[PDB]
Paper text:
Seven antigenically distinct botulinum neurotoxins are produced by the bacterium [name] and they share considerable sequence homology, and structural and functional similarity. They are produced as inactive single chains of molecular mass 150 kDa and released as active dichains, a heavy chain (HC, 100 kDa) and a light chain (LC, 50 kDa) held together by an interchain disulfide bond. HC comprising two distinct domains is responsible for binding to neuronal cells and translocation into cytosol. Catalytic domains of BoNTs are zinc proteases and cleave SNARE proteins with stringent substrate specificity though they share significant sequence similarity.
The crystal structure has been determined to 1.5Å resolution. The electron density in the residual map (Fo-Fc) was well defined for the hexapeptide and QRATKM could be modeled unambiguously except for the side chains of K and M. It appears that K could take two rotamer positions. This is the first time an uncleavable substrate bound structure of an active botulinum neurotoxin has been reported and it has helped in unequivocally defining S1 to S5′ sites. The amino nitrogen has replaced the nucleophilic water as was shown earlier. The side chain of P1-Q197 is exposed to the solvent region but makes a hydrogen bond with Glu164 OE1. While SN/A1 was cleavable by [name], SN/A2 was not, suggesting that the N terminal DEAN is required for cleavage.
Numbering used by the authors:
A (entry chain B): 197 to 202
B (entry chain A): 1 to 423
Amino acid sequence: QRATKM
Amino acid sequence: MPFVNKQFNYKDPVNGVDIAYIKIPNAGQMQPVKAFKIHNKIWVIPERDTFTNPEEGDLNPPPEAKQVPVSYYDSTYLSTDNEKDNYLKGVTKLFERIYSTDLGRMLLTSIVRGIPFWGGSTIDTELKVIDTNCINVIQPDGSYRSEELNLVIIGPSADIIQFECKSFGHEVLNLTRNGYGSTQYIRFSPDFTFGFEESLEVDTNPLLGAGKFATDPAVTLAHELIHAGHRLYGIAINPNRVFKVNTNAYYEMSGLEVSFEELRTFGGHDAKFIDSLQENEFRLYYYNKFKDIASTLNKAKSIVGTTASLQYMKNVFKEKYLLSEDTSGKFSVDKLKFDKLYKMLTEIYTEDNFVKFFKVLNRKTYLNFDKAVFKINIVPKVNYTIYDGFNLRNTNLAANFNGQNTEINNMNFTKLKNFTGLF
Ligand SMILES: [Zn+2]
């Protein structure tokens, strides 16, 4: 997953 | 020598072998999509992913007033032949860039050898494939033939920047966490990239920076390939096991929890947030899963289907899991061999290590804040190459990561959205 959501 | 021995063009005629219309086992209906087999066990589908998840088949962006901070929508992206041609060429170039490094060659080799386990049989004496680890390929005669595969690179779903590994589950088995493994569908795009900041205190702050430097998409794809490797070997850490971040005040005020799977994948100092106790727990847990596989293989006396022989498939899995074989031909898991493979897949293949091989600037931790999303085009060699990425040798972009500097190499980046200050 590219990033945590932020 | 190249990883992809054919420079495919999206418009090349289908042949029913490596250029064909296919359907995926999503337990639903779908029109066949044109796909390209770029390497043994690896396919590319230049389409937006409205297939792996039934509830995510709408690319239409909800009302502007219902959009989160870090996300980007464009229902028209990847809808034309030219875009698909560029997508295919972009993904191919990134595989070559990754394969050009020793670390990338090691990772891709592990991925190709990581065939999803044949655990679809309900009878212990028979070894059978799991249908969801295959795709149905339309042959020249119009009939469908089932082909096993390990990896599929597909376009993103509605949220274009939400790259991640998706795979079909089992009714009873947790394929990505029980040692079995499953075919991985990586939602990814080589047509966009993300900005980050050169100063750690700025990159890890949600209110500062506009995203001066651009992440090399080869690192982004490598990150997903690392997850894919974990999932293909069935050793992914349950996403419920997380680090309730308490090392960043901004993460804390938002109660942001990051999965250990992500920290492991990034590597470097991030991996240290998983304490020794937990690390040993997981190592033991997966060691036990490999043992279950060895036992299952030993019970199998006949193979199901006419695609391969039992002796061949047993050898395939002996090699995948590096099992030991005794006189009677019985399999067992050697603790030393397991630890070595487990460590290779979890500590050697990491984002931080890939950064070292590519010699690029990159975020220093996964625990940061996104800055911006840029539109890019890595297909032209004057823009990006297999060997230098954006930092083209013998040009003003060769030094100081000038190629990744969106201000200096502005012609290669178009900022589509700023994320800073929106959190
Ligand atoms: Zn990730």
